[PDB]
């Protein structure tokens, strides 16, 4: 063994030690992918959630920490309309956070189509989706009014009765309780049409200004990891 | 000086021994292959499954000598040794299996009830360390049981293998410590881990109604089959050790103790089925 | 707006093209000439392979 060979082996051992150090850090941080629309409020979340916890750039990274657990969120910007190619780079991610506006009736069908496209993608057949019905304050304001009618855009509304399993907060009119579970019903009906039991969709109701979304993401990710561990450790 | 009769010992033993051998050799070999497949793809259970299967094979390989002992009328022909070896693999090799069962239970509990914490306790190196500790306990117990010369002759010249009827003074303490350590600690650990797993799975959201009733069936089946395999043996062991020594009493419960010992041999058939066959991963590679 | 596309098509339309038999002969001749230098096709002696 020449001196050069010994030096090369020593360098390889040092690099291997550093890589082993980095592996533990890598397998302690969970990656989340954020999707939405321009009319949505994903900017509001990424602004007033990381505070409490270059011109042409594609990926924006947000780091937050809940109960000493690290989370990295990735927002996609400056890209084109096509998504069939860069969506496959996200296969080992923990969850996809879909933020949908619940007040604009004009752009609800497009949101449903986008959710259907993400749900039935070939490369995303094992990734769960956390759904955020954002800006519920405006839905209440518009519902308790006359210059609007949700029955106009969707003709199936005047056949819907509120589900028995509901938890209306005190001080909410019955009207705002009915025109609010219909949207979740549509999204979950799209979810349960296919997918078998490999992946699930978690619904939530969220306002623009609130500090609970980190807790909700933590709970959903914990459930996802629990299900993966049940599959892995030979229980189901 | 107490020829005990052993009509039963010569009637039901051969059928059980031959059935266990035939059913449990290929089953354990296939379980070993599955354990290889798991350990290749960076899974911590693979170490435990492989070690459990190896312990089961070690137990199984000892039956043919016992089978020839049973076939023959009270006689043990091979040598003046290997009775202090096959005796170990028949009487004290059933606890490596329970140790690895408890290891699997704790691994499952830390995987499904605290998924965000204890990442360093579920790696391959920790599994190798605990496996080596369990096998070192096996080796120390095995360097025990050899300071005592244990072969006696019968009134009708025969050779009994690893049993003394009027229980000896030195065996009572072994019986007591065996009962406590091997059947009050492992059972408490199993119950306290599986209750936690069931609570965690019933508090979940993404699992459909059907699968929680399934996991429940598997968990109760595992615990119940373990109990039915082991509990009567230990109960009869205490019954003999505490206040059942006088030779007349001894002649009385020979059936009970040997029936319990014969029943405790089904672990080698139960373990590969419950830990290597009823799993979607095992059905996806066959 | 569309003048660029038609200009590109016009530029690419007038080019010098040859027969397919000529291209096939060229590729076949090149492969035959450099057929004795590819280690993948013909396994090399074990004293020459460094992997």
């Amino acid at each position: 063994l020449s001196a050069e060979d010994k030096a090369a082996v020593e360098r390889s051992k040092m690099i291997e030690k550093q890589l082993q150090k980095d592996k533990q850090v890598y397998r302690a941080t969970h990656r989340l992918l954020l999707l939405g629309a321009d009319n949505s409020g994903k900017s509001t979340i990424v602004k007033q959630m990381r505070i409490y916890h270059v011109k042409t750039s594609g990926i924006f990274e947000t780091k937050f920490q809940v109960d000493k657990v690290n989370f990295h969120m990735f927002d996609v910007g400056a890209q084109r309309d096509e998504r069939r190619k860069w969506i496959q780079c996200f296969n080992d991610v923990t969850a996809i956070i879909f933020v949908v506006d619940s007040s604009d009736y004009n752009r609800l069908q497009e949101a449903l189509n986008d959710f259907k496209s993400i749900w039935n993608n070939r490369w995303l057949r094992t990734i769960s989706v956390i759904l955020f019905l954002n800006k519920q304050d405006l839905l209440a304001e518009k519902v308790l009014a006359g210059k609007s009618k949700i029955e106009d855009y969707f003709p199936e509304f005047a056949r819907y009765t509120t589900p028995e399993d509901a938890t209306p907060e005190p001080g909410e009119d019955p009207r705002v309780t009915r025109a609010k579970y219909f949207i979740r019903d549509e999204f979950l009906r799209i979810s349960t049409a296919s997918g078998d039991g490999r992946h699930y969709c978690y619904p939530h109701f969220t306002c623009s200004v609130d500090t609970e979304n980190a807790r909700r993401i933590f709970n959903d990710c914990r459930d996802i990891i629990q299900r993966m561990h049940l599959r892995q450790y030979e229980l189901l | 000086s107490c020829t005990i009769d052993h009509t039963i010992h010569q009637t039901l033993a051969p059928v059980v021994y031959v059935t266990v051998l035939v059913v449990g050799f290929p089953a354990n070999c296939l379980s070993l292959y599955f354990g290889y497949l798991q350990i290749k793809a960076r899974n911590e259970l693979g170490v435990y499954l492989c070690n459990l299967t190896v312990a089961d094979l070690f137990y199984i390989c000892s039956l043919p000598f016992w089978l020839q002992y049973v076939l023959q009328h009270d006689n043990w022909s091979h040598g003046d040794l290997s009775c202090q070896v096959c005796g170990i693999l028949l009487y004290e090799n059933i606890y490596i299996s329970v140790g690895f069962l408890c290891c699997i239970s704790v691994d499952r509990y830390l995987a499904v009830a605290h998924p965000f914490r204890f990442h360093q306790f579920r790696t391959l190196k920790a599994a190798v360390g605990v496996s080596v500790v369990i096998w070192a306990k096996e080796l120390l117990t095995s360097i025990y049981f050899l300071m005592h010369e244990e072969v006696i002759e019968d009134e009708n010249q025969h050779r009994v293998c690893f049993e003394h009827y009027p229980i000896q003074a030195w065996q009572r303490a072994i019986n007591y410590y065996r009962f406590l350590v091997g059947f009050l600690f492992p059972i408490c650990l199993l119950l306290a881990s599986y209750q936690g797993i069931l609570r965690a799975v019933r508090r979940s959201h993404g699992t459909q109604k059907s699968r929680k009733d399934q996991i429940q069936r598997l968990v109760l089946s595992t615990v119940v089959i373990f109990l039915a395999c082991f509990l009567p043996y230990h109960v009869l062991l205490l019954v003999r050790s505490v206040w059942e020594a006088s030779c007349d009493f001894a002649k009385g419960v020979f059936n009970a103790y040997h029936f319990s010992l014969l029943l405790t041999s089904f672990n080698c058939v139960a373990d590969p089925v419950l830990y290597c066959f009823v799993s979607e991963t095992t059905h996806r590679d066959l | 707006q569309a003048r660029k596309l038609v200009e590109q098509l016009k530029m690419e339309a007038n080019i010098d093209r040859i027969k397919v038999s000529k291209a096939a002969a060229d590729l076949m001749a090149y492969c035959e000439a450099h057929a004795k230098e590819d280690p993948l096709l013909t396994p090399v002696p074990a004293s020459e392979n460094p992997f």
Binding site: D5, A8, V9, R11, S12, I15, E16, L19, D22, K23, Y26, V54, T56, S57, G58, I59, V76, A78, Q79, R80, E82, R84, K85, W86, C89, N91 | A41 | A2, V6, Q8, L9, K10, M11, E12, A13, I15, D16, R17, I18, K19, V20, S21, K22, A23, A24, A25, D26, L27, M28, Y30, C31, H34, A35, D38, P39, L40, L41, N49, P50, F51
Partner: protein, 338 residues
């Protein structure tokens, strides 16, 4: 007039198609049926490289045929030494998502890029022992797909938006921009003489460019679905492409035609990489179904199969000497076949 322009364009397209239809003479299978088959080729694993953390999306051999560079989702470039399987360097990345790599011909630089819209250049040989970032190139809009060095001072890149560019390294400004596609472009291959370069995009078209001038010359449209790989035949007068249609094809430049199609009714998955050999006798291609394949270009009959992976194959490469072939898959393993 819009109608007049559309009619003129349609007529000119018909005219250019007529010349192609007329110049066709004979299938390659008729002239190639007088050459003995390659024989059954059976290649086996010789080395194995471990150490990556997650999937790998790139791989490029150097010019000395002994060093290697790889990329992974964890954000790490590792420089290997294939003979002794040691590790020579370990470069951490600013952006985690990387989907391309390159190795400078001289042996001084390594380039990487991805969803971050930046093509980074690294300096391996410094006065100090560490490796540091030389210059970051910016100016695209979409996502990079491939980068290849011409000399130590120029570089050619691909982008998500329909555009390809040529850069200068000392001065970070662009020097020429290439336009004309209608979809995402995803592969590059510089010519051996470093004067022409061809690329393929997601609109079932492949184009050739002149680097000095800046204008397209020919357009080929054999594919129906989107193209995923491209590489030059060693001559410099042909190039082969693979697509998500499960069919590979081989074009030539002077004839301006489409010669052969490697179609099989058993395979349904798509192609994910294509690379030739030293003699131009074996075509290698990765597939989505956990296996790689070997084809004989002149006769179009499958000859070999290379299956040792547990996930999807993503990269492929052949050394300049001709004495090794490397693959990479999403199981974080490199396999140096031979």
């Amino acid at each position: 007039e819009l109608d007049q322009l559309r009619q003129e364009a349609e007529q000119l397209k018909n005219q250019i198609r007529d010349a192609r239809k007329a110049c066709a003479d004979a299938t390659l299978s008729q002239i190639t049926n007088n050459i003995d088959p390659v024989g059954r080729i059976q290649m086996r694993t010789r080395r194995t490289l471990r150490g990556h953390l997650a999937k790998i999306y790139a791989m490029h051999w150097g010019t000395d045929s002994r060093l290697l560079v790889s990329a992974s989702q964890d954000g790490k470039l590792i420089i290997w030494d294939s003979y002794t399987t040691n590790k020579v360097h370990a470069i951490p990345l600013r952006s985690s998502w990387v989907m391309t790599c390159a190795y400078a011909p001289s042996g001084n630089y390594v380039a990487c890029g991805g969803l971050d819209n930046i093509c980074s250049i690294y300096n391996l040989k410094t006065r100090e022992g560490n490796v540091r970032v030389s210059r970051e190139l910016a100016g695209h809009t979409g996502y990079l797909s491939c980068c290849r060095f011409l000399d130590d001072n120029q570089i050619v890149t691909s982008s998500g938006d329909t555009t390809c560019a040529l850069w200068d390294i000392e001065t970070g400004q662009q020097t020429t921009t290439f336009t004309g596609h209608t979809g995402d472009v995803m592969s590059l291959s510089l010519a051996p003489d470093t004067r022409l370069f061809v690329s393929g995009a997601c609109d079932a078209s492949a184009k050739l460019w002149d680097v000095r001038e800046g204008m397209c010359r020919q357009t080929f449209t054999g594919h129906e679905s989107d193209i995923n790989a491209i590489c030059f035949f060693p001559n410099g007068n042909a190039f082969a492409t693979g697509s998500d249609d499960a069919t590979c094809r081989l074009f030539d430049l002077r004839a301006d035609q489409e010669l052969m199609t490697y179609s099989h009714d058993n395979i349904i998955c798509g192609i994910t990489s294509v690379s030739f050999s030293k003699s131009g006798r074996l075509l290698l291609a990765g597939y989505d179904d956990f296996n790689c394949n070997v084809w004989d270009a002149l006769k179009a009959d499958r000859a070999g199969v290379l299956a040792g992976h547990d996930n999807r194959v993503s990269c492929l490469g052949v050394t300049d000497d001709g004495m090794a072939v490397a693959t990479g898959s999403w199981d974080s393993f490199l396999k140096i076949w031979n």
